[PDB]
Amino acid sequence: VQQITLGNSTITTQCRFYTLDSKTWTTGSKGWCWKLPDALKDMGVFGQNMFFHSLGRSGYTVHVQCNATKFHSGCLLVVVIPEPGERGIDLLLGNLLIFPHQFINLRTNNTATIVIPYINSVPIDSMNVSLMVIPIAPLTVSLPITVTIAPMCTEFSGIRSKSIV
Amino acid sequence: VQQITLGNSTITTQCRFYTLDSKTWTTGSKGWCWKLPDALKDMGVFGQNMFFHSLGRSGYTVHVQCNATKFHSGCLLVVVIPEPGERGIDLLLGNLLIFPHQFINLRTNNTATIVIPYINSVPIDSMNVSLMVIPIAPLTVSLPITVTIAPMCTEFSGIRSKSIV
Amino acid sequence: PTTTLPGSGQFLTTDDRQSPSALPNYEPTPRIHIPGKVHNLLEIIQVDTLIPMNVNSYLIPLNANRQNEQVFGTNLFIGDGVFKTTLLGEIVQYYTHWSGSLRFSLMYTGPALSSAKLILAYTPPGARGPQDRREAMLGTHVVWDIGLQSTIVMTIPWTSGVAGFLSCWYQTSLILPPQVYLLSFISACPDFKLRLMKD
Amino acid sequence: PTTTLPGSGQFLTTDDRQSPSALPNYEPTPRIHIPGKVHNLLEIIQVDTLIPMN
Amino acid sequence: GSETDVECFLGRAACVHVTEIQNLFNDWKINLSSLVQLRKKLELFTYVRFDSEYTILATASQLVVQAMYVPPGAPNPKEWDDYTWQSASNPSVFFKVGDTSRFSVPYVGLASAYNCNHMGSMAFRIVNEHTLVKIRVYHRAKHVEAWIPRAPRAL
Amino acid sequence: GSETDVECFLGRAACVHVTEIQNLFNDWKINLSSLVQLRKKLELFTYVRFDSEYTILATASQLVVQAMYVPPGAPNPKEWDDYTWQSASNPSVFFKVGDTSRFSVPYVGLASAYNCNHMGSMAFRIVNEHTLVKIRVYHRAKHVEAWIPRAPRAL
C-alpha cells in the first residue's frame, strides 16, 4: 500500500532499499548522472558482495522522490541509459525518450519508479547502465531530490564456494 | 420517361443537372471543348465543395441538345477525351472515335447522352477528361446547342471532418 | 549440358545470395535472451519524443495578458524545420514514402493554481493556416483546459505528404498565481508505413 | 558436372528470360481497377473510325 | 492471334540509350520515349503499367563498368567519384567490358500506372584507375497492362 | 512494411575498405564504422548480432590475388612473404584480377552479440612473382538481430 519494507529498510511511496544523498535541485542546476552498480560500491553489504565475488548479475528498482508543496513548478526527466561513486555526477535530450524513462511533473506527481532488468551481452559479468535525472522545465517557486535504489534478483558465482574434493 | 428530375433541377429528353450557356452553331463555326470538373468551378454548390475539399472523386452524365426543326442538315460529333472555365473553348478527327463518342445527325436525332465514370491512375485526386463537340457535316438551313452536365456518384475526403480527439 | 545466358558473372549489390562459409564446422558463440529485441523499425518510431519547437529549445514559452493570440504554429513537413532532429524525422530521413497517421501530444509544466483555455487547431494540407481565434475554432480543433487536464493527445490523420498546419491559440489569458512552459511530443500511430529506403 | 554447348553467353533480343530483381523486397504501388483495360489489340481495331475519302 | 496481346506487342527488347565514356561518366533520365518506334507504340494507350528488364552491352575501342540504378527521388552523380557511387541504397552492378549485365526493376511509379513518368535514372562509369567504351542499354517491358486506348499520333 | 525489418534495413552490400597494392600487401582491421552511412545505421542499436558476407572486386591498371581472412586473436602479416600467408588455419581465397571473390564469415564475437568489437582482419597480396591493383571489399550483414534501440547521433 504505502510502506514497502525490505530487510531492515522501509520506504514510503504511492535485497534492501539504499537511499542515496539528497540532491538540492536549484533553479540554476543542470542535472545528475549515476552509474550502476558503481553508485553502490561503498553501500554496506552490497559493497561487501561486490568486492567478494568476481562475476555477478542483478536487476534494480529505482525510486526518485522530490518532497515539495503543490505550489512549485518545473519538470524532471528520469531515464536509465545502458552503455564517480555514490555521489554520482553533478552535470540530444529530445531523443532520450527511446530509453525506459518517466517524467516527474510537480504539478501532478512527485515520485517516479523504474524497474531495470539485467541488460548485458554476456549472462554474468564482473561488477552496465546509468540513471540520469534532467531538469527539463526549470524550477520556479530549490527542492531536495531523494533517490532510493533497491537491487533485486541478485545472483553470484560458484567460485569462493566450490570444493576441490 | 421524358422529365428526369434531380434535386431542384428538371430536364427533358427522349447531384443535379447543370445547364451551361447555349452555344450558337453558325455555318462557319469550328467546334467547342470543355474540361471537367473545370467547367463546373463557378457552378453553385458543386463549386463550393470543389473549393472546400482538397481530394475528390465523381462520375458525370452529359446531355448535348440542339433545338431545331426537321429541315436543318449537318452532323455533330460528341466525344469525351481523357487527358477556360464554364464558357469552355470556342475552337486527326477521323481517329477520335476510339474514345466513347456519339454522333448527332439532325436528320434523325437532336440529343446525345454520355455517362463518364471516374477515369484516373489514383483512386482520389485534387479537383481529368474533356467533352468536345465538333461539327463534321456543316450546318445547312445557325442553331443553339445546350449542354447539361449532371455530376453523379460524387465522393469526398475525410479531412474537414476527422476529429483530433 | 547447359548454355550460359546474358547477365552471368554480374555483380549486383542488391542480389541476396547464399554462400560458402570461410570457417566451416565452427560453432559460433550461442544466442542468449537479451531484452528489447527489435525485429522492425516500425516499433521504435512509435515512441513519443520531444519536438524542438522553440534545454530551452524544447520548451514552448507561455506569457500572461494574451487573449485571441497564438502560442505556436507549425507546418507538418517531417523532413525539415522543427521535426528534422526528432527520432521520427531521423528515421523518416532513411525512406522516401511514409504514408501514415501521427500522434502529437502536449504537456503543461506550470503551478497547480494556474489555469488557462487553449484552442489547438489543425488545418489539413492544401488549405491556409488560421489567422484569428475565430477562424481556428471554425476549423478542426480541441478546446484544451490546462486547469483540469495537464496532458493532451491529438492524432493527426494519415497524410502521405511526399503537409498542413497545427497551431495553438490563447482563448483566455494564462492566469498565474501571485513564464511557464509547454512540452510537445511526436510519434506515429500503429498504421504508419514506410517504403523505398534511401541514403 | 556439365559441359557448355554452342550459343552460350549469346545476346538474343527476342529471348524472353526471367531475372534477378534490382530492388528486392520492395513492395510496388498496388494495382487499382482502372476501366477499359486492353489485353489484346484485336479489341481496338474493331472500333469504327472515319475514312478520309475526299 | 498471339502477336496482338499486349504481353507480346510491347514486351520486346529495344535500345533506349547509347553513350560513350573515357578512362568520365554518363547519367541518363529514364525516358522510353527516346526511341520514336517505342514512343509510337506507347502513345497508343493513356495509362500503362509494366515491370522493367534492362540488358547492358559494353564494348571497347582504342576493364570493369559500374551500372548504377538511381531510384525515383534519389540524387544523380555530378562527378565520377561522388559519394552516390559508394551509397548502399542505389543498387549498382559490376561487370567486365565486352561482356553484358542484365537485371530487372519493378514498377516504381507513384500512381497505379504511368500517364503518357519519372522511372529513375541510370548512371555509368568505368571502375579502373588511370580507351573509349560505348555503353548500350536495352529495355524490355514485362507483365504489361494498359488502359484507355488513345488515337495514334498523325503529325 | 517489408523495408523496415532489420533483415532488410541492415542487410545490404556496402563498400567498407578500398586499397591499392603493387607487384606489396595491405592488411585491414575489420571496422564496419569506416563508412559513415553504415555507422549511422549501426549506432541506432546498443547490441547487434549478424553473420558476415564479403564480396571482393580486384581491378588492374598499368594476375592472382590472395584474400586471407585472419580470425579474432590470430596474428596479421608484417611482410607480403611471412609464414602467416602459408598457415593452414587462416582461410584464404585465390582468384584472378578483374574477376570477383565472395564468401561468408559466421558470428566470431566473444559475447552473444557485438557492443557498439574485433571481427578479425583481411590481408591482401598479389600472388605472382617479379601493375597497380585496387582491391575493394563489400560487406553484407546476414540473419541480423538487434537489441536495446539507442537514440541517433546528432553532432
XYZ file of C-alpha atoms in Angstrom, chain A residues 70-162:
93
model
C 1.641 21.896 -4.720
C 2.909 25.455 -5.488
C 6.268 24.608 -7.137
C 6.586 24.487 -10.927
C 9.090 22.677 -13.227
C 9.574 19.123 -14.586
C 12.320 16.442 -14.264
C 13.065 13.631 -16.799
C 14.121 10.351 -15.087
C 15.751 7.982 -17.650
C 18.074 4.961 -17.348
C 20.593 4.720 -20.229
C 22.554 1.456 -20.964
C 26.252 1.990 -22.003
C 32.196 8.905 -9.592
C 30.988 6.648 -6.673
C 27.780 7.057 -4.585
C 27.824 10.868 -5.149
C 27.240 10.442 -8.914
C 27.981 13.310 -11.340
C 26.578 16.865 -10.888
C 26.315 17.812 -14.600
C 20.236 15.354 -27.854
C 17.828 15.431 -24.838
C 14.706 15.240 -27.008
C 15.665 11.784 -28.341
C 16.469 10.272 -24.847
C 12.823 9.124 -24.556
C 13.637 5.992 -26.646
C 15.116 4.523 -23.392
C 12.846 3.477 -20.439
C 12.027 6.875 -18.890
C 9.435 8.721 -16.813
C 8.703 12.445 -16.261
C 8.124 13.982 -12.760
C 5.850 16.967 -13.288
C 5.477 18.583 -9.815
C 2.045 19.908 -10.725
C 0.675 16.270 -10.829
C 3.220 13.840 -9.227
C 6.408 13.913 -7.075
C 7.707 10.302 -7.437
C 8.970 8.151 -10.346
C 9.778 4.392 -10.224
C 11.900 2.456 -12.816
C 12.486 -1.353 -12.725
C 15.710 -2.239 -14.657
C 16.442 -5.944 -15.553
C 19.976 -7.286 -16.210
C 20.965 -5.757 -19.615
C 24.314 -7.145 -20.876
C 25.670 -9.168 -23.889
C 27.056 -11.933 -21.541
C 24.945 -13.857 -18.912
C 27.264 -12.796 -15.994
C 29.995 -10.107 -15.706
C 32.459 -8.569 -13.248
C 30.838 -5.758 -11.258
C 26.297 -1.549 -17.348
C 23.567 1.178 -17.075
C 23.282 4.764 -15.831
C 20.379 6.563 -14.141
C 20.193 10.193 -15.259
C 17.887 12.919 -13.850
C 17.473 16.021 -16.028
C 15.510 19.229 -15.193
C 13.641 19.984 -18.438
C 11.203 22.728 -17.276
C 13.116 24.939 -14.767
C 12.319 25.174 -11.059
C 10.050 28.152 -10.328
C 8.885 28.686 -6.680
C 15.274 24.900 -4.501
C 13.857 21.373 -3.815
C 15.585 18.270 -2.363
C 15.584 15.094 -4.544
C 15.985 11.740 -2.773
C 16.967 8.654 -4.792
C 16.330 5.123 -3.458
C 17.853 2.122 -5.291
C 16.846 -1.444 -4.323
C 18.896 -4.233 -6.019
C 16.591 -7.240 -6.552
C 17.001 -10.762 -8.098
C 20.779 -10.650 -7.396
C 22.791 -13.813 -8.298
C 26.543 -14.610 -7.932
C 29.322 -17.088 -8.885
C 30.084 -20.614 -7.605
C 33.765 -19.576 -7.048
C 34.553 -18.860 -3.306
C 32.290 -21.910 -2.551
C 33.244 -24.859 -4.866
